[PDB]
Symmetry: C2
Subunit: 173 residues, 2 copies
């Protein structure tokens, strides 16, 4: 039978619209979105991750996929306003409804920066690699229900929440 493993990677995220910037404090690695009056929208953020796997010495193929679990940021006050964070892996969406292929040795995918996993999955020891996702704001609500993509219509304030991505590894023999 296949060997399978799962891990969930969670980033904390904040977004700000029209708030004071007299004091800004940012944990390293955190996803920080800022509404820009300039372009009427939010910046994107690259968020990096480290992966480690244990080798399966008799495996003959390896697959690594990702799937979005949570992505909702909510304002800190009484507004109920939310933002949803889109996640991209090398130009391909990582969504809640499917598994985005990152490595698939059988079908001709190495995973780019994740290539060490594609080469080490059937070593007898552990293999490590580092890559990232691009995170962006893909929708929002004024109040938790009324959805928008015109972000100029959002109430001012701060949103926060966790963005969690599930990773699924499969070793085949």
């Amino acid at each position: 039978a296949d060997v399978t493993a799962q891990a969930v990677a969670t980033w904390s995220a904040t977004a700000k619209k029209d708030t004071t910037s007299k004091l800004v404090v940012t944990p390293l690695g955190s996803l920080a979105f800022q509404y820009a009056e300039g372009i009427k929208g939010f910046n994107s953020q690259k968020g990096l991750f480290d992966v480690a796997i244990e080798g399966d010495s008799t495996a003959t193929a390896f697959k690594l996929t990702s799937r979005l679990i949570t992505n909702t940021l909510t304002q800190l006050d009484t507004s109920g306003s939310t933002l949803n964070v889109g996640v991209d892996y090398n130009g391909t969406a990582v969504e809640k409804t499917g598994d985005t292929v990152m490595i698939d040795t059988a079908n001709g995918v190495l995973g780019g920066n994740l290539s060490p996993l594609a080469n080490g999955y059937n070593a007898s020891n552990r293999t490590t690699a580092q890559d990232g996702f691009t995170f962006s704001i893909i929708s929002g609500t004024t109040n938790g229900t009324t959805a928008v993509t015109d972000y100029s219509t959002l109430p001012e304030g701060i949103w926060s929440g966790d963005v969690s991505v599930q990773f699924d590894a499969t070793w085949t023999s």
Copy 2:
């Protein structure tokens, strides 16, 4: 009248005890605590942050404090097991019940690695500096209510939660 500003810095945190590590994925900058049988407890980790302030040309003193807001990690399963994360700044606890002084120019506390802020607070530019807190596991429960003394008594699994710290800046003249 003095000028004040506030910001909340949030880290995503995960703790693990005796779980399978066939696949491990770790967002950069996230807090990660691993139980080790040898020490009967978890590692600590220094989590870094950047602080940016806007100058106030009329000010004659500056103060920056921190206060812990949330620090509870909860297991992902039905256990109800919790861990609480302690936060230290240069050997002084940052707690939920008071404000820990980081900079206080009126009293010659310049802020160590944050000292550029003490120098630039009344300048007419943005000043940025970096520092960190040491994060550690300071308490835990087996089930949400039973306090443990010996971490070896914890149920196996993964705890996750956000650790959030409020920063407060005051410019006086």
